Amino acid sequence: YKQYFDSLPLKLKSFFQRYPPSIKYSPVSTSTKAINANPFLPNKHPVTQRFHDPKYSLRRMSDVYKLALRYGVEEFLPPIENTKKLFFEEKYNKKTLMKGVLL
Amino acid sequence: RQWRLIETRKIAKQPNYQKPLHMPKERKKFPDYKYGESNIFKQSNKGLYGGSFVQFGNNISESKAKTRKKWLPNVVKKGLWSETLNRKISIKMTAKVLKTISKEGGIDNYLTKEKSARIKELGPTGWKLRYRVLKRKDEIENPPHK
Amino acid sequence: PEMPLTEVRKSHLAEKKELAEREVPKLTEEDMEAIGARVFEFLEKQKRE
RNA sequence: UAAUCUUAU
RNA sequence: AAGUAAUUAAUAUUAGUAAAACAAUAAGUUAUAAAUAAAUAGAAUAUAUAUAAAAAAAUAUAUUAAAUAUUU
RNA sequence: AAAUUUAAUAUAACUAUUAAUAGAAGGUUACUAAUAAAUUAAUAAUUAAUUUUAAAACCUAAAGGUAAACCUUUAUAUUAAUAAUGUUAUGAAUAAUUAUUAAUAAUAAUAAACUAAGUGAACUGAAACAUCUAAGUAACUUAAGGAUAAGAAAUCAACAGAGAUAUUAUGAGUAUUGGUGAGAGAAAAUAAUAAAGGUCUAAUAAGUAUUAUGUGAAAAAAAUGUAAGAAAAUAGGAUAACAAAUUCUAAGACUAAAUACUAUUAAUAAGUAUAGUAAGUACCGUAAGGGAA
Ligand SMILES: [Mg+2]
Ligand SMILES: [Mg+2]
Ligand SMILES: [Mg+2]
Ligand SMILES: [Mg+2]
Ligand SMILES: [Mg+2]
Ligand SMILES: [Mg+2]
Ligand SMILES: [Mg+2]
Ligand SMILES: [Mg+2]
């Protein structure tokens, strides 16, 4: 099991190292200095109400998610839902076709 | 915007000292400016230009006849009050810079703004001014004995 | 002589220090094991498919 | 006229 | 002391393989279907058929394909 | 059993490629400008490696000068403290010289190519020429480094997706574009080359985005002078325009490797003896400069 984990891609491993699944990261935006703060979401600083750019630039986050999907480990990541990025099958399912296609 | 003619300047990295063949006689009064002095539009080094430089472009006619021209920023010499220094400081000032100063409330504020952009768009003179102001502020705050 | 720190800068530094003071969420061995197990399960599922 | 600018000490 | 080299293109000759060829990591290039500006159109002696203009569909003009068998 | 030949090798050639490794004194004339060890390994002398150590005149923009190799300062310096010494005026005081100790400054000879930035021709081509071209090339100027630049998407794409840069094959001389002339000419995508390639150092960014206007890599913007000038992720950017939908988060940052140029070593030469070491000398010119045998 440990061996299996080790085998996983490098990026994913790195991510796990600093954001483990032991903690449940908030779905919605939060204080930037809370310890349940999602890396993928633009959190806000308490002193000076300034939205900090996500701790994971969107692309990187997407990549990570993809990697997780590839090895089944989606649930052990924090939730993406509040970033508007969906992936693969779910996206296909839930997509409202464009105004131009429908009429 | 971009600070291409500031953040591209490079200065000989100092070797730190735990002697050199030629050491200077005086003592470095001011902290080294990251980006150094500009060797490009040296008129700018005297004052506060906000990272604006001379542009060079083409005068173009009705016959599309290109002919080189330059563009200067609107520099104005202007004595402005510094609460911390307790005196008016006169310098060269791009009118844009003046406007910015007005917006921000005082020359000290302008100098002492934290962002890297601000640092970039100060000159060496600007940097010096900033140093003066912040040092002064520190002194005001913190006498030798508490 | 190094340029003195600005108020905002000082505040930032303080904040950083405060952040440092707290315990860093280190990766749990149990968590790792769980992850591994999950991976294994996924692999098995794939094989079955 | 404590806009700006010119000269002298 | 003076028709050379590089990167391409078209023709020819000979060789290799050949309805495929080169490369074979995946691509890609040319050939295998003609035509039209382009579009959702496209092949059984020719007098049949394909595409273009035309049109209900033919004709008419151009080019193409199509003849106990073994594809170009 | 010694000689002869053949091929290879030097401190003793340069040139091209490939591979590895690394990123460094000239002159002038003389009071000529030198060395000394130790330790470790190999076998007391030994060679090598690793080290510490003496000397080293003058000149080569910036001790300060000058007509380069000279002159002028005066570290056989000045100040202080003392010690022996001679003189003067009254054991104490003042000046002079020598000798010890302490204090107080000393010397920009430094490459070349490569990289980035500023300015930026013209000949030429168009069979004339002015738009265009040559060309952001030559050249001049400035600044850094062993490399520099770039770099972890306010990117591409198309409703399926990818996932930093760098530059090579293809894509493709295709799309795009041009006094629609001369001509110029992408990107996605797939491959190689490559390295662990991701990672926080911002309390997350306005006179900033944007607009107007003047400029601006022949095709694709990102830049920029002058004034107007936003918004909080319930928000911005991305396409003539709008509506949908996608995607990314500017105004804060760090970054090995592939690459360029030099120098050395090794190898390979249907390379050079007029591209085979002399000499940047003779000589030519006031000079920059040219330049033999
Ligand atoms: Mg004289
Ligand atoms: Mg240049
Ligand atoms: Mg760099
Ligand atoms: Mg950088
Ligand atoms: Mg060009
Ligand atoms: Mg932001
Ligand atoms: Mg960013
Ligand atoms: Mg003569």
UniProtKB/Swiss-Prot annotation, chain A:
The chain holds residues 3 to 105 of 157 of the full protein. Component of the mitochondrial ribosome (mitoribosome), a dedicated translation machinery responsible for the synthesis of mitochondrial genome-encoded proteins, including at least some of the essential transmembrane subunits of the mitochondrial respiratory chain. The mitoribosomes are attached to the mitochondrial inner membrane and translation products are cotranslationally integrated into the membrane. Keywords: Mitochondrion, Ribonucleoprotein, Ribosomal protein. Component of the mitochondrial large ribosomal subunit (mt-LSU). Mature yeast 74S mitochondrial ribosomes consist of a small (37S) and a large (54S) subunit. The 37S small subunit contains a 15S ribosomal RNA (15S mt-rRNA) and 34 different proteins. The 54S large subunit contains a 21S rRNA (21S mt-rRNA) and 46 different proteins. GO terms for molecular function: structural constituent of ribosome. Disulfide bonds: none annotated. Its main location: mitochondrion. It is found in: Mitochondrion. Present with 1550 molecules/cell in log phase SD medium. The keyword Mitochondrion applies. Signal peptide: none annotated. It comes from the Eukaryota. GO terms for biological process: mitochondrial translation. One of its GO terms (cellular component) is mitochondrial large ribosomal subunit. Belongs to the mitochondrion-specific ribosomal protein mL59 family. This is Large ribosomal subunit protein mL59.
Swiss-Prot record, chain B:
It comes from Saccharomyces cerevisiae (strain ATCC 204508 / S288c). Its main location: mitochondrion. Component of the mitochondrial ribosome (mitoribosome), a dedicated translation machinery responsible for the synthesis of mitochondrial genome-encoded proteins, including at least some of the essential transmembrane subunits of the mitochondrial respiratory chain. The mitoribosomes are attached to the mitochondrial inner membrane and translation products are cotranslationally integrated into the membrane. Component of the mitochondrial large ribosomal subunit (mt-LSU). Mature yeast 74S mitochondrial ribosomes consist of a small (37S) and a large (54S) subunit. The 37S small subunit contains a 15S ribosomal RNA (15S mt-rRNA) and 34 different proteins. The 54S large subunit contains a 21S rRNA (21S mt-rRNA) and 46 different proteins. The chain holds residues 22 to 171 of 258 of the full protein. Belongs to the bacterial ribosomal protein bL28 family. It is found in: Mitochondrion. Present with 4000 molecules/cell in log phase SD medium. This is Large ribosomal subunit protein bL28m. One of its GO terms (biological process) is mitochondrial translation. The keyword Plastid does not apply. GO terms for molecular function: structural constituent of ribosome. Keywords: Mitochondrion, Ribonucleoprotein, Ribosomal protein, Transit peptide. One of its GO terms (cellular component) is mitochondrial large ribosomal subunit.
Curated annotation (Swiss-Prot), chain C:
Disulfide bonds: none annotated. This is Large ribosomal subunit protein uL24m. It comes from Saccharomyces cerevisiae (strain ATCC 204508 / S288c) (Baker's yeast). Component of the mitochondrial ribosome (mitoribosome), a dedicated translation machinery responsible for the synthesis of mitochondrial genome-encoded proteins, including at least some of the essential transmembrane subunits of the mitochondrial respiratory chain. The mitoribosomes are attached to the mitochondrial inner membrane and translation products are cotranslationally integrated into the membrane. It is found in: Mitochondrion. The gene is MRPL40. Component of the mitochondrial large ribosomal subunit (mt-LSU). Mature yeast 74S mitochondrial ribosomes consist of a small (37S) and a large (54S) subunit. The 37S small subunit contains a 15S ribosomal RNA (15S mt-rRNA) and 34 different proteins. The 54S large subunit contains a 21S rRNA (21S mt-rRNA) and 46 different proteins. uL24m forms the wall of the exit tunnel. Belongs to the universal ribosomal protein uL24 family.
